[PDB]
Design an enzyme around this catalytic site. Sequence first.
Site, PDB file in Angstrom:
ATOM      1  N   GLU A   1      -6.380 -13.037  -2.075  1.00  0.00           N
ATOM      2  CA  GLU A   1      -5.649 -12.415  -3.193  1.00  0.00           C
ATOM      3  C   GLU A   1      -5.418 -13.467  -4.297  1.00  0.00           C
ATOM      4  O   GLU A   1      -5.557 -14.646  -3.993  1.00  0.00           O
ATOM      5  CB  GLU A   1      -4.247 -11.943  -2.766  1.00  0.00           C
ATOM      6  CG  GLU A   1      -3.462 -12.981  -1.957  1.00  0.00           C
ATOM      7  CD  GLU A   1      -1.983 -12.707  -1.908  1.00  0.00           C
ATOM      8  OE1 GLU A   1      -1.303 -12.514  -2.945  1.00  0.00           O
ATOM      9  OE2 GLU A   1      -1.368 -12.653  -0.815  1.00  0.00           O
TER      10      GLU A   1
ATOM     11  N   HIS B   1       3.364  -4.654  -5.703  1.00  0.00           N
ATOM     12  CA  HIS B   1       3.688  -5.600  -4.635  1.00  0.00           C
ATOM     13  C   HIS B   1       3.162  -5.181  -3.287  1.00  0.00           C
ATOM     14  O   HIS B   1       3.729  -5.241  -2.165  1.00  0.00           O
ATOM     15  CB  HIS B   1       5.246  -5.796  -4.582  1.00  0.00           C
ATOM     16  CG  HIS B   1       5.456  -7.281  -4.452  1.00  0.00           C
ATOM     17  ND1 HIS B   1       5.751  -8.097  -5.520  1.00  0.00           N
ATOM     18  CD2 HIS B   1       5.349  -8.082  -3.377  1.00  0.00           C
ATOM     19  CE1 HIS B   1       5.814  -9.338  -5.139  1.00  0.00           C
ATOM     20  NE2 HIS B   1       5.586  -9.362  -3.842  1.00  0.00           N
TER      21      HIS B   1
END
EC number: 3.1.27.-
Length: 109
Positions: A72, A101
């Site tokens: 990520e 998130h």
Amino acid sequence: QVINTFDGVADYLQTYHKLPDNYITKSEAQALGWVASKGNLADVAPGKSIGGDIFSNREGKLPGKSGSTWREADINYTSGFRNSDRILYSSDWLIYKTTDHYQTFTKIR
Ligand SMILES: [Zn+2]
């Protein structure tokens, strides 16, 4: 000429097969003095964003090809606390986005 948008990073990843030079890992930022609760990444690593770390994907939200791994990177970061925008990229260069998130993801490449 900072590459930190969804389209800039996705295109960079798919062409160069690595993140652009403004990215550092969580461990690297921590060692530089990044303290998450103080929101100080821009003070200790000017111009950098956190990215490059393996993302577990144990909840099966992202598609899992056997042998393939996910990583990520933070998107849209300039200063302060980290935001909730992340680009997720596999070892096959599939690219996904989250803006909530890591609750949900959508494909962008
Ligand atoms: Zn969750």
